Design a protein around this ligand. Sequence first.
Ligand code: MG
Ligand code: MG
Lengths: 255, 258
Amino acid sequence: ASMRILLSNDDGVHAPGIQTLAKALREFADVQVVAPDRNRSGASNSLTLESSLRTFTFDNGDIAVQMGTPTDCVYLGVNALMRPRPDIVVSGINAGPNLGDDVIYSGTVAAAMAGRHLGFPALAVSLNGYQHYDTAAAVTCALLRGLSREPLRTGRILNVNVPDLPLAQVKGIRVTRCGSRHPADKVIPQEDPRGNTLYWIGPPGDKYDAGPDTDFAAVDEGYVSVTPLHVDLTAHSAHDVVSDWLDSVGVGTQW
Amino acid sequence: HGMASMRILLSNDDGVHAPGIQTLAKALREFADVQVVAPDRNRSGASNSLTLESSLRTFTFDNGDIAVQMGTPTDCVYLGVNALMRPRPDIVVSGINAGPNLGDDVIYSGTVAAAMAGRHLGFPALAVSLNGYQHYDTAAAVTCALLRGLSREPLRTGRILNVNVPDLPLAQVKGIRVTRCGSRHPADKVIPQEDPRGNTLYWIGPPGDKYDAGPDTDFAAVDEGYVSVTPLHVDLTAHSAHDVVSDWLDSVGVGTQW
Ligand SMILES: [Mg+2]
Ligand SMILES: [Mg+2]
């Protein structure tokens, strides 16, 4: 009768986002934290395959995985560290948005995606700023109460982006689709003291597809954005064009 | 016709030293202008990860190959396209990977991620994976064929092609199928291993069993000795769930007062 939540993030176990959320969730749910030991923004859906992973348990039960990715954390949490397995994965609250085509790089999104085969759809929660963690926590709690009110029948992952506003100013929720950007192109070089050039990944590309039905627009307008995600990367609409193309260029056929 | 008619950024996730990338490099160099930009070590499992908290250093080998030190496959393509290469590449080719990248494994794949990073270029990017370790020459011939195809006629729709090659002599490959990604059961094994001081450390276990591996899937194509070609995109939206999620929110009163 009580929800059992595996809580992770990509900011790391000590981040205000995850700690604020953990506090809110523990009011009405059982919560196990399994999270990276440090900041893994940009970890996307990476997994540690070449080495075994070391865990550390804090006094309050929180588990940190040393050099663990967000996916590593959920993998260990679901398969080894929680008995019995969790009802759900919640990942967040992230410091900063996970919108549009940025989502494939997101560690926060990835931890949620790793929980896609559990009893409840996974939640990835990101704040569009750094101030109103309480607002994002309230939205998450509402969603979780929601999921115990009626089953959500389709969608294994919800990507939630919350405006960085006091709760009273959040206008509502929009169900959205992922927008997109032009390709990022600006690298930031910086010389080391020996005059060798090192390279920083620069800013994202300008918004391309950010119209009224997108996650970008919803957040800009002061709404919580909720996008259902899946892991199928197939571009189904391209099927026939590719097939005809192959025949036309004679690849895979003699004639 | 043409020893260097196409400019290729060649990357992988196994790293610059991998036989799969070196075999492919030799094959591509017969007709293309090839620049290798790849990880300095095996980054299998790197998915679409990228380095944000630190700057990246490059290392150039004697043959002109570039490794990005501690670089992920996405780092390599991002840097290769945006800073390192002149002229810029016409296309990204990622591979040949030692091992399959099929079904829902693709989102965790460093090989696929490199190709995905080149999706905005003149030609659609290729990720190329061999279903095993032996017949790199087979995967190379298949890759060369696709590239020659792209120079004969441009591909209209589809920005990334995920190519899986059966580990067979070329003569035994039956043909080519355009496929969709299948999917697996979740991996569920954790392999514990005590360190010298008695601490338990954990290894990620093997992939789950195939779940969706029917006749239209990448899994089935490879299993019956065909090259699988799946067009991929980066849009993670489950568009078919939109109405269900909307109706659901309303029915549970989340986001509305009533
Ligand atoms: Mg983060
Ligand atoms: Mg690999």
